Write a protein that binds this ligand. Sequence first.
Ligand code: BMH
Ligand code: ZN
Length: 224
Amino acid sequence: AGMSLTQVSGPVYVVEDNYYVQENSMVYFGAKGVTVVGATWTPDTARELHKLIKRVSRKPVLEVINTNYHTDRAGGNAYWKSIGAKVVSTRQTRDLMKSDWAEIVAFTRKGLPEYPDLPLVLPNVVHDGDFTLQEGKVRAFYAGPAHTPDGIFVYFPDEQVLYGGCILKEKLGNLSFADVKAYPQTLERLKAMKLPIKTVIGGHDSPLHGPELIDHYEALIKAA
Ligand SMILES: C[C@@H](O)[C@@H](C(=O)O)[C@@H]1NC(C([O-])O)=C(SC2Cn3cnc[n+]3C2)[C@@H]1C
Ligand SMILES: [Zn+2]
């Protein structure tokens, strides 16, 4: 289908969003409500994800995290705000979105002319540091610049699942916004945290991998 939502471990689900360039995002089904990690490409793809969420749980969608300021992680924001969900990001992501949204939309449309000219929709919950949701079961952190200056990781300690949004994936992908020399330093900072990881979900290409996706991508970026 256009979008799928599949259980990875317990309350942790992976979204495969096949619109435009395939992007993978996360959903966490909590006791009081649902957290979406990555807003998906557009308001219409966000509505498609909501439809799948509502076949799994009746609990409200409480918040959606923009793991960077780009279209594939924040494009759905209009829809999520419209249904009362908070849109959550770091201060750095929010500030880059304000100044650079028009630029990323135009860049996205160069490769994907069919992609809509979406108006700016900013996060309404903004964090100055690392942060958690779902009583500490969803943990968002910054470990330096990589694919964009602002990209964050989201870790799910109970399930030992790491999501890196656009940072981790199978193919080199698009480096036009990246800090190529810092990229492996950020991945090494991440590895030095020694997080128990069983599963890494890539933000593009096939989602399900083990911890070695980090090493895979590190080696690719060091050759770029
Ligand atoms: C700058 C781009 O990077 C960004 C965009 O232009 O919106 C968005 N995120 C990527 C990325 O590398 O994470 C790309 S996805 C990347 C590019 N190619 C094309 N098809 C698959 N791959 C993965 C996507 C359009
Ligand atoms: Zn991306």
